[PDB]
Amino acid sequence: MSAMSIYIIFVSIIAILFLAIDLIFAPHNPYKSQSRSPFNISFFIYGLVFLLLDLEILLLYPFAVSEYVNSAYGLAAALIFIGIITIGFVYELGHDALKVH
Amino acid sequence: TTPRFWSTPLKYCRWAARERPALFFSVVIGALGPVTLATVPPLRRLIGDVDAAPIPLTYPIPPGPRKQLKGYDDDTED
Amino acid sequence: MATRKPAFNQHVLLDTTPLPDSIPKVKEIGASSAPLLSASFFIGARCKDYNDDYMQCKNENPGRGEFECLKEGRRVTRCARSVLKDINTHCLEQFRAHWQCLDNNNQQLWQCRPAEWKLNKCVYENLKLEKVIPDQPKNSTPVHLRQRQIFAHHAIPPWERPFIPGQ
Amino acid sequence: NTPTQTYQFPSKTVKTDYPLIDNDPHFTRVIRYARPSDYAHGLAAAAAGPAALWLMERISPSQVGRGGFAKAMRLAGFIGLAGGFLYFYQRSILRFYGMSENAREVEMDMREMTDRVKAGLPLYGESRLSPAMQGVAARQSRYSALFFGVMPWFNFVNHNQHGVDTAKYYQQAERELEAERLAREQA
Amino acid sequence: PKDAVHLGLKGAAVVGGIGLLFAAVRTSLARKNVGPWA
Amino acid sequence: MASGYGLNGGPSRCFPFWQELLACYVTNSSEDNPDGKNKCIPVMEDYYECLHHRKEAARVRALQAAYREAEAKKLQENPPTAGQIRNLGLLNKEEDTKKVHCA
Amino acid sequence: NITLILFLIGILGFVLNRKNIILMLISIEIMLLSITFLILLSSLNMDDIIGQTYAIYIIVVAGAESAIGLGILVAFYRLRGSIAIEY
Amino acid sequence: SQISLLLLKEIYTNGSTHIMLDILSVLAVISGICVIISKNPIVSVLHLIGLFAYVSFYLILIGLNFVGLSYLIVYIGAVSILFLFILMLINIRTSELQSNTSNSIPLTILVGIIISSFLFKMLPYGVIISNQKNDLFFITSKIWDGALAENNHISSIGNIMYTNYNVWLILASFILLLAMVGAIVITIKP
Questions:
Q1: G 3-62 near H (Cβ less than 8 A)
Q2: Distance (Å) from the C-alpha of residue D138 to the closest C-alpha of chain A?
Q3: Which of A49, A52, A65 sits opposite H154 (nearest CB)?
Q4: Does a structural domain hold residue A35?
């Protein structure tokens, strides 16, 4: 039985005990349509730009653990990839889709 | 008021450094990569800073024919 | 038995059947990882040619290198065995100091330079074997001959000196 | 010193009209072997872009605001410069491929490459890249100028995989290394 | 010679099976809560 | 697979079979003789066997049935225990090594 | 075989669905994950890093396609107010 | 008369139990079924996230750590957050999205039999080796020349990702570029 496997068990057991105490000892009594409004496009845009930018960083992590072998040739294609994705970031900034003002 | 880059490029760069520093120097920092790629390796060769050879990442098979060795044969055992 | 890295193994399978008598018998090396790491450059000194020959034989016989190179396989065993007997005859104390240091130091050579310098001097003046690392940068001192090791957990005593052969 | 192996990599053979010089010539060879008409054709091609945009403006005005046309001309000039330069590069590299008349070039490569043999130089130079990485670079840029309408690429690597048996260069070098000796003996 | 009855049964099965498939699409595309036994 | 790049940074384990299949096709098939590619049939089978191991699986389970059939017929008066087994070939356990090897 | 069952589940999403177009996007994501799962297990059996590389590009493309589809759905919801088909 | 083949349990250097692969497989199908039968689309996405996790954990346990962690970071961490964002904002009545699943039951059965029967025959022997007395056993050994400097999977990908196959990387960048510009153009006021 590995340390990592035991670790997840113990951390989950901690959460169970805390739930157990409050669900066993703390007093309990059951004290106990809507309107539709438009939502702000900014929140979709935050998640959008996060997701695409988070995908681009993931594609660079193999490069950071493979630099010795990639050498000059890998760096060129890594730089080309970086250059292409920073252009799309320039589009995101320039069009103020983060609602700068 | 706000300068235009294609009209007066030097004045624009002065305004950008003072008025949009984060974006301006980000463009400067990003440009230093290619600049150091074009300047430092040339200068290192001049000053004798030679690149290290690659370390082996596979068994280094010798080229050419085998050496026709004699020694440590089965008669040498025990 | 494939070279795939196992992930759910729970058992080991052993076969007791020996090699057929048609194959000459060689005694296997009885040294564990730390001693033969501390003897590796001395094996590489005496046995380079046989080591290379055995790997060239296998490259000459793709897909069949195991079966067609057994005799050259046996010669590598006997040459490395000769170095380990030789060191155990002339340098046993310094041998043991180095690999016991290595075995306590994650088998990292830059954590045991004083013991290595002691053994390299002893091996050189008994068996005339030199540690050699190909293609080290010429402008710098070779890393294994540097007084200070940047990555050593214990700083190195100023008095302990690198062994340069022929000094 | 013939290396006894003058064709070391399986190369793609392509049916063309003129002899193949180099299926992956170095960027500087393509510039150096360019003909003066290549500069003429490339410059005129580059100018065509902004000239076409200017002509559309004069005959069919865009009705753009005050500074809009200057911005479009700046982008049209860059587009023309890119397309003009790629066309210039293509014209020269097509002779290296043997896809266009190349007699001046076949002579020049024979002249240049025989000279390196007599100097003991490597035929194509010395690379900082590993041999395997040279193979990857060679297999990426070989015949790549035929794809310039979609993707640009240039060879900036000193590899040895150029698709041509190199025995001819070594034959030419020792043929005149002997001639230069006989003249020295006759003196 | 061949068995007309045996071969005819296979013919009914192949195209009846396809008809049963088209029957399932009509049932799936029904608007009212009719059920799986439609 | 056929790429030539395995999981550990080395070449892929079936690549030599793929290289030989391509080698057989290139040098035996041609436009003058299209039927030369029939020589590639056994090499293609070897490449499919390296990928998926069907024939090897069929052999090993056929043999294991026979092995377990014969192993039941014999009588094991004193089979080696796992503790003795774990002492095989160890520095100071000559008794257990002899017992395991039945020598 | 698990990948096969997962592909069925994504397939059945369309069969069991008359009015929920959000479930339509989810079924496409289950199918893409099922196919990627199959590639990954096969490349482990065949000792091929290219299969893992193929999986990484499907993840990137699936992520980029989810971005576009959620964008198109937002441009649709802005004019409509419902993602429900009146069936 | 000796038993030449010997089998015994491994003490340390043991390895994980294949039983855990079975629990994860049923958790994936249960969560997967819950995705397409859940009434509320938000709860449907929660079950989908659960499905991503089980597949991700599956990949980690067979040794595919980098790809498995990428699923957690990218699909759970980014894609499904974007899904929960939009769903949790838009106005949704569950009554409007619930159809009579019983009308789909025979088509469900038929589609399952037809598709599974055809698709299963396509799977190579590797994936179907351990699913549905004479059980076969995988055996592995070591090499030394192959293990001189092992790469982790992320380093093996990085070796070829930017050089040998970098056309794929360029193409993917263009798709990411197009996705960024496209999703912005159709959603925001200029």
A1: 3-13, 15-20, 22-23, 25-27, 29-30, 33, 37-38, 40-42, 44-46, 49-50, 52-53, 55-57, 59-62
A2: 11
A3: A65
A4: yes
Domains in chain A, number: 1
- Which DSSP string do the residues of F47-100 spell out, in sequence order? HHHHHH-HHHHHHHHHHHHHHHHHHHHS--SSPPPHHHHHTTT-TT-HHHHHHH
Q: Supply the DSSP string of D29-48, one letter for each residue.
A: HHHHT--HHHHHHHHHHHHH
Residue among A41, A44, A59 minimizing CB distance to G60: A59
Residue range of the domain that includes B17: 1-78
CA atoms within 13 A of residue H25's CA, in its CB half-sphere: 13
At B78, which helix (H) or strand (E)?
Answer: none
- Are H54 and H24 within 8 A, CB to CB? yes
Distance of CA D96 to the CA centre of its chain: 6
Instruction: Name, in order, each residue with C-beta under 8 angstroms of H95's C-beta and a sequence gap of 6 or more.
Output: none
Residues D134, D159 contacting (CB under 8 angstroms): yes
F52 inside 8 A of chain H by CB: yes
Helix axes F15-28, F41-52, angle to 10 degrees: 160
Structure tokens at C74: 């046996």
| CA nearest to A40, candidates G78, G80, H78, H41 | G78
Instruction: Indicate the SS3 state at residue C115.
Output: helix
Domain count, chain B: 1
CATH number at residue A59: 1.20.58.1610
Helix axes G21-45, H19-37, angle to 10 degrees: 160
**Residue C132 belongs to what H/E stretch?**
none
Query: CA C117, CA H66: separation in Å to the nearest integer?
Result: 41
- What chain G holds in terms of domains, given with CATH numbers, is 1-80 (1.10.287.3510)
User: Which residue type is seen at H89?
Assistant: L
Residue H50, in any domain of the structure: yes
- Asked if the structure places residue A100 within a domain, the reply is no
Residue B58 to chain C, least CA–CA distance (Å): 12
CA distance A99 to F52: 55
Q: Please tell me the total count of domains within chain H.
A: 1
The resolution in angstroms reads: 2.5
